[PDB]
């Protein structure tokens, strides 16, 4: 899965 980043 994606690593955590806002937006």
């Amino acid at each position, epitope marked *: 899965a*994606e690593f955590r980043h806002d*937006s």
Partner: antibody
């Protein structure tokens, strides 16, 4: 000013459990958007990401090492920890503690690195 | 895993030469939020890696403008316009969009003689 300082056992034997500590200053892991993590490097070789832990207890791991890795923190004491079970000689490396935020303002990149702690796994 | 492939892995250069390092990813590094978390780091002997470039083409604070990054999607390039002795060391591209976070193998910028 942001500082990160790794500590470990120096030398341990294969099959033992590695317990790493990162102590930092200049920021807080209770801050929304903040994270702290671990990357390692065997001597003369490349960089391998291990794990990251977020302000809200969301933990992210390198899936290949999931059976050996546990990341935790103590936000109040400005510490993060990494436990690696069943080490072998190939876990010999410099272990770096790194800050990375998940918000643009707090710095979504590895700008701050500790100087690293060397861990030698040998019998 | 998103594999980050750097070419060449050793790059001899003369002082003042242009240098260019290719970094290709096995899948797109564009995150769902629209950002491309492609970073470049330089590591000098006995030292921790230092951030040079983030989001493909932004220079980190204090990085001289002889350094630039470019590209899109899966295909990226680091460029140094005039190589100085301070630039010698190991360059890593990196992707931060997908778990596990992954670095390229490292490209050693070395001196021609």
């Amino acid at each position: 000013q942001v500082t990160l300082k790794e500590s470990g056992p120096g030398i341990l034997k294969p099959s033992q459990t590695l317990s790493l500590t990162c102590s930092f200053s200049g920021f807080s892991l209770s801050t929304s958007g903040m994270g702290v993590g671990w990357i390692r490097q065997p001597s003369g070789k490349g960089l391998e990401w291990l794990a990251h832990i977020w302000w809200d207890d969301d933990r992210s791991y390198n899936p290949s090492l999931k059976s050996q890795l546990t990341i935790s923190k103590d936000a109040a004491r400005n510490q993060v920890f990494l436990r690696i079970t069943s080490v072998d000689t190939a876990d010999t490396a410099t272990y770096y503690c790194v800050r990375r935020a998940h918000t643009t303002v707090l710095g979504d990149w590895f700008a701050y690195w500790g100087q690293g702690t060397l861990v030698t796994v040998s019998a | 895993d998103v594999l980050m492939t750097q070419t060449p892995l050793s790059l001899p250069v003369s002082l003042g030469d242009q240098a260019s390092i290719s970094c290709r990813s096995s899948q797109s590094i564009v995150h769902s939020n629209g950002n491309t978390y492609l970073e470049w780091y330089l590591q000098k002997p006995g030292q921790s890696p230092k951030l040079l470039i983030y989001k493909v083409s932004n220079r980190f604070s204090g990085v001289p403008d002889r350094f630039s990054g470019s590209g899109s999607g899966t295909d990226f390039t680091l460029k140094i316009s005039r190589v100085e002795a301070e630039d010698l060391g190991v360059y890593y591209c990196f992707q931060g969009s997908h778990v596990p976070l992954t670095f390229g193998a490292g490209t050693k910028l070395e001196l021609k003689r």
